[PDB]
Amino acid sequence: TKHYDYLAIGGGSGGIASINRAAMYGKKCALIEAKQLGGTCVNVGCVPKKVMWHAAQIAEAIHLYGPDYGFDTTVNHFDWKKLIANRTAYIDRIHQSYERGLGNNKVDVIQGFARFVDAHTVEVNGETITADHILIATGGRPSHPDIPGAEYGIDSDGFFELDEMPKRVAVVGAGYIAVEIAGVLNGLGTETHLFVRKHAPLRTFDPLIVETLLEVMNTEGPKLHTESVPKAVIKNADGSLTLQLENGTEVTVDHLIWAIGREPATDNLNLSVTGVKTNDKGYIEVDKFQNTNVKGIYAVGDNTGVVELTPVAVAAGRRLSERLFNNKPDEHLDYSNIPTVVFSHPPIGTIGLTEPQAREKFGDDQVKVYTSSFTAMYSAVTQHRQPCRMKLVCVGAEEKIVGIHGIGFGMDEILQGFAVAMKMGATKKDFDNTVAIHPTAAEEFVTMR
Amino acid sequence: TKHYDYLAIGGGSGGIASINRAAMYGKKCALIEAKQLGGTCVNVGCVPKKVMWHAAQIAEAIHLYGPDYGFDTTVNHFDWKKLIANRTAYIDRIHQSYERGLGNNKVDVIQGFARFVDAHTVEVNGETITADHILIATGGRPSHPDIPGAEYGIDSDGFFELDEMPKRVAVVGAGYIAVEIAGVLNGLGTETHLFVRKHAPLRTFDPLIVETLLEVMNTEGPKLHTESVPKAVIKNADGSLTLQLENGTEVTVDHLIWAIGREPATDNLNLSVTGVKTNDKGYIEVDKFQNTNVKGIYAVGDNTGVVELTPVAVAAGRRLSERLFNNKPDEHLDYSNIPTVVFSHPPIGTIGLTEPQAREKFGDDQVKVYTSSFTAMYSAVTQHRQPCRMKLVCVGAEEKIVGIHGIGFGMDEILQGFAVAMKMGATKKDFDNTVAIHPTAAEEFVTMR
Numbered sequence A, B: 001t002k003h004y005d006y007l008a009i010g011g012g013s014g015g016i017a018s019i020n021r022a023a024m025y026g027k028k029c030a031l032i033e034a035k036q037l038g039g040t041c042v043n044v045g046c047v048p049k050k051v052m053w054h055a056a057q058i059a060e061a062i063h064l065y066g067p068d069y070g071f072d073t074t075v076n077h078f079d080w081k082k083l084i085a086n087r088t089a090y091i092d093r094i095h096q097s098y099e100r101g102l103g104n105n106k107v108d109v110i111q112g113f114a115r116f117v118d119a120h121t122v123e124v125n126g127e128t129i130t131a132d133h134i135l136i137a138t139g140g141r142p143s144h145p146d147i148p149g150a151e152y153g154i155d156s157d158g159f160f161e162l163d164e165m166p167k168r169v170a171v172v173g174a175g176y177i178a179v180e181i182a183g184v185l186n187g188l189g190t191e192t193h194l195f196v197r198k199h200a201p202l203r204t205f206d207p208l209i210v211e212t213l214l215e216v217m218n219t220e221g222p223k224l225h226t227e228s229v230p231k232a233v234i235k236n237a238d239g240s241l242t243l244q245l246e247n248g249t250e251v252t253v254d255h256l257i258w259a260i261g262r263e264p265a266t267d268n269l270n271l272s273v274t275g276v277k278t279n280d281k282g283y284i285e286v287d288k289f290q291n292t293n294v295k296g297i298y299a300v301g302d303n304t305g306v307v308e309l310t311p312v313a314v315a316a317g318r319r320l321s322e323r324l325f326n327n328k329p330d331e332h333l334d335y336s337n338i339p340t341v342v343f344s345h346p347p348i349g350t351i352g353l354t355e356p357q358a359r360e361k362f363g364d365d366q367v368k369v370y371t372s373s374f375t376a377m378y379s380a381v382t383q384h385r386q387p388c389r390m391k392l393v394c395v396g397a398e399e400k401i402v403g404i405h406g407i408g409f410g411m412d413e414i415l416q417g418f419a420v421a422m423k424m425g426a427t428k429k430d431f432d433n434t435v436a437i438h439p440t441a442a443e444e445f446v447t448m449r
């Protein structure tokens, strides 16, 4: 039986980040990963998603905007297999980079599925391993609906396994994953349908953002089907699929992608023997320091039921190692005002409170909202003008900024610096005092009246 | 003879901004413009430049990156005339928007070239106009070298007048205009040569930015010719031009663009009768409140010899009107830490001090520099990988950020928010405390160690 100071179960965003930081402080570490290093983000998440998003931007440059910039083009072939091969080669380079990093930090990397034996012992590939400190960073996986024909659909992992350009696709879901996948497929030329259960996708985002996204989808696709609850999926004689909704509507497609949610990977590792508490949905419960209720067992990332983003898992994992192994007993991640980007068409950036949230929390008389609406300059010379809308939500007489929201070309890159300003307590006057950069979309955030 | 409370000479960035703000406070205003509303920026500057930059981005998406994303394309025709027509139509819409704004504010707009008669009187189109307050916001114009054959070259105004795609072009200069024009032409497919007098273009930018730009130019064009001082331009029998450099080198091209510098438009308006002081280069001298040495005469923008950017002219003009007409005697523009973007390939963003400047000012022991180097994700799956490099220049034990510099895809949109943070006095810890947005280029600014 092998013993380690620190063992991380799961070699994804949180596990790799935490184990490497612990190793830097001289701890004897092990990392157990059942599949590929980098977890969901590198293999079937943020990375391949972004590559596909870039492919869609190119397709749109060629088909939508290019003609009005003078480019008369012919796409002789769109080689999906080549795109996937290059995407895969990049991911392989990322794996190799992580392997080198872990090897250089002298972390023992074990390929296998870990199962607990007791609170401080796991078994993997028939070997028993003990550790004084165990991080459970097992992430999650896609969920699937329990309706007739659900098995004819694929999930986001399946989307990344597609080896040809789909002709007609139904995407079901109302979160960022559904929106992103539907936008990518629509941009590439697939006849794309997005099905949401209520009035819009991202329904709790600021109304400015939600309504602008609806406007764009209603002009450029994907075709949005609202108040659409899946009832069944029928496989037709020709191999096509018909999605039947509870309202009586039906749409026929070649592929159906379920993007209705995710669930935590906390059910197959014999967690019951550890005494670790989970909530009704299977998420591991943690305190502000990532401690479970069991001494020496911690959890970070998607398996904990909170802000399911890579940088959150990474930062929580690193700060945990700082706390445990670098004599910083109070070190922890601040989960307030974390910025989010959705790689929709066009992209969305958001931080903090929406206008309705701020009004509910502070009262109408304490809230002041500033907004801007303009046409993206990239699209302005074309027949496909696209809006860009931005909002600052302010509280108090000093107009402290408590929310920043934008939708439009460039929002993906615009938000980060504004997140720093908001973390520092920026007020509207701080924005007023900064000179604009022209011509950009970002300058609109510092020019509102 | 008409009398006004406030008269602005020049209907460009500064004049329009200032006159509209004064009109908002009930002043009787006039604006005199000799050419087109919007000045240099709208007509032959920031606006058409950005449209052309977007055209080059599309060309690069098609020719450079697209193939590795699976796009086998054929450009049947690149219709330069169509691009110019759409660019021009957009500019026309901007003119119409400014006209409506000025008409709604009841500003008298006069199309003509104003010449002073005395310190408070001008003549335009044979009409005499007096005003209690006169803003001189006349901007500048391109400079031309005094060498044999200089007349065969065109300047940046001439670049916007091109009505066909040039095949071979020499761009001469080392500032942002030369870099931008050369990058656009190179991206569109013109055989492009850039000639700088010393080691590099943008020679005083941070060395990390300068050397990365050289690296990219040396891989993807334009062809950079350094220590290159123009001697003469020869027109050959076939109509081509040969640029002879003093070092004995030469390059034959179809068109030559001088982008060496600009000069102020302060020489043809009979300024001598006003007593207004100018420096040896013709720039109008102003105090922190945009006052000239003559009571009731002010100047803002490019004619004053400072930060020649549109938002600076705009902000100075608006603040001047606040001061003069809205009872804010101390209102003025803060010219420190103004952010700049250069629309090079790839774009550059910079604020504050370079590393050498900070070391010289504060001493080596007080400066700490953080840097990041990575490959732009857009280019990572292709055979044309492009670097992205970033730097934070910090001073003191608290590591106050005094300079922020980056070069890479997205820098154009990334910088603004970081400018707000720097204006608020951000330190490295403030960046450390902000959670990253993944996957973006911007996150690298908050993840440096």
Ligand SMILES: Cc1cc2nc3c(=O)[nH]c(=O)nc-3n(C[C@H](O)[C@H](O)[C@H](O)COP(=O)(O)OP(=O)(O)OC[C@H]3O[C@@H](n4cnc5c(N)ncnc54)[C@H](O)[C@@H]3O)c2cc1C
Binding pocket: A009, A010, A011, A012, A013, A014, A015, A032, A033, A034, A035, A036, A037, A038, A039, A040, A041, A042, A044, A045, A046, A049, A112, A113, A114, A115, A137, A138, A139, A140, A156, A177, A265, A268, A269, A300, A301, A302, A303, A307, A308, A309, A310, A311, A313, B437, B438, B439
């Ligand atoms: C389609 C999609 C797009 C996304 N886009 C973004 C984005 O743009 N930006 C962003 O910030 N986030 C994005 N995310 C979220 C991001 O991927 C996750 O938040 C992040 O991967 C969570 O990290 P983690 O360490 O909690 O889990 P993971 O990275 O999922 O890692 C968990 C690892 O544990 C392994 N494992 C599980 N059980 C065991 C066991 N018993 N033994 C050994 N190994 C085990 C798994 O194989 C896996 O590799 C996206 C997710 C998806 C699905």
Ligand SMILES: Cc1cc2nc3c(=O)[nH]c(=O)nc-3n(C[C@H](O)[C@H](O)[C@H](O)COP(=O)(O)OP(=O)(O)OC[C@H]3O[C@@H](n4cnc5c(N)ncnc54)[C@H](O)[C@@H]3O)c2cc1C
Binding pocket: A437, A438, A439, B009, B010, B011, B012, B013, B014, B015, B032, B033, B034, B035, B036, B037, B038, B039, B040, B041, B042, B044, B045, B046, B047, B049, B112, B113, B114, B115, B137, B138, B139, B140, B156, B177, B265, B268, B269, B300, B301, B302, B303, B308, B309, B310, B311, B313
């Ligand atoms: C190629 C190029 C690219 C640029 N790109 C950018 C950029 O990306 N970002 C940025 O911030 N800045 C950019 N600039 C700079 C920007 O254009 C200027 O800083 C800005 O236009 C200066 O504003 P202004 O009001 O001082 O002068 P201008 O906008 O030049 O306006 C002066 C006006 O006065 C008129 N005029 C002059 N004399 C008289 C007279 N006697 N009577 C009546 N009218 C008169 C002129 O016709 C002109 O319209 C660029 C400039 C160029 C040349």
Ligand SMILES: OC[C@@]1(O)OC[C@@H](O)[C@@H](O)[C@@H]1O
Binding pocket: A035, A039, A040, A043, A044, A139, A140, A141, A142, A157
């Ligand atoms: O791709 C299959 C899978 O099991 O791989 C490990 C994790 O990324 C899971 O989310 C994912 O469903």
Ligand SMILES: OC[C@@]1(O)OC[C@@H](O)[C@@H](O)[C@@H]1O
Binding pocket: B035, B039, B040, B043, B044, B139, B140, B141, B142, B157
């Ligand atoms: O286009 C010609 C010109 O005279 O128009 C007015 C200003 O924009 C000048 O800079 C410019 O040279």
Ligand SMILES: [K+]
Binding pocket: A431, A432, A433, A434, A435, A436, A446, A447
């Ligand atoms: K501002």
Ligand SMILES: [K+]
Binding pocket: B431, B432, B433, B434, B435, B436, B446, B447
């Ligand atoms: K950070």
